[PDB]
Amino acid sequence: ADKELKFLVVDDFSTMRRIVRNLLKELGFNNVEEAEDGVDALNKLQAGGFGFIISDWNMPNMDGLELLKTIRADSAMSALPVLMVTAEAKKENIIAAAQAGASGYVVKPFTAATLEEKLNKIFEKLGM
């Protein structure tokens, strides 16, 4: 993976976005932009050049699953890796997200080591 890959961190909590941005930084990924909910993220992804999405499952207006489904249906972005973040793993949640095309899932709070493993896994799975 290019350390310059442009990440989009999506969450309605500012502080969780700042945590994620800081974890990424710690791994050498400094190209990060933020969005507050699903529609805000889609507005931003329009501009182009993003290479990886980290989205929270639970967001108002357009939740994680809906944003993932919109990204997967879009011819120009359908291959973008999407890591879903949740506060609690639920079997039906994991299945719905996988079937909708999620690249992986992580339960918060998490550390840099955990995030690193998740990223490495996705890059491995996608051959990046």
Swiss-Prot record:
GO terms for molecular function: metal ion binding. Mg(2+) binds at D11, D12, D56, N58. Keywords: Acetylation, Chemotaxis, Cytoplasm, Flagellar rotation, Magnesium, Metal-binding, Phosphoprotein, Two-component regulatory system. It comes from the Bacteria. PROSITE patterns: RESPONSE_REGULATORY. The modification N6-acetyllysine is found at K91, K108. Phosphorylated by CheA or acetylated by acetyl-CoA synthetase, depending on which acetate metabolism pathway is available. Dephosphorylated (inactivated) by CheZ. The keyword Magnesium applies. One of its GO terms (biological process) is chemotaxis. Binds 1 Mg(2+) ion per subunit. Residues 6-123 form the Response regulatory domain. Changing N58A: Diminished rate of phosphorylation. InterPro entries: CheY-like_superfamily (IPR011006), Sig_transdc_resp-reg_receiver (IPR001789), ST_Response_Regulator (IPR052048). It is found in: Cytoplasm. The keyword Transport does not apply. Pfam families: Response_reg. Its cofactor is Mg(2+). The modification 4-aspartylphosphate is found at D56. GO terms for cellular component: cytoplasm. Interacts (phosphorylated CheY) with CheZ (via C-terminus). Involved in the transmission of sensory signals from the chemoreceptors to the flagellar motors. In its active (phosphorylated or acetylated) form, CheY exhibits enhanced binding to a switch component, FliM, at the flagellar motor which induces a change from counterclockwise to clockwise flagellar rotation. Shows autophosphatase activity which is enhanced by CheZ. This is Chemotaxis protein CheY. It comes from Salmonella typhimurium (strain LT2 / SGSC1412 / ATCC 700720).
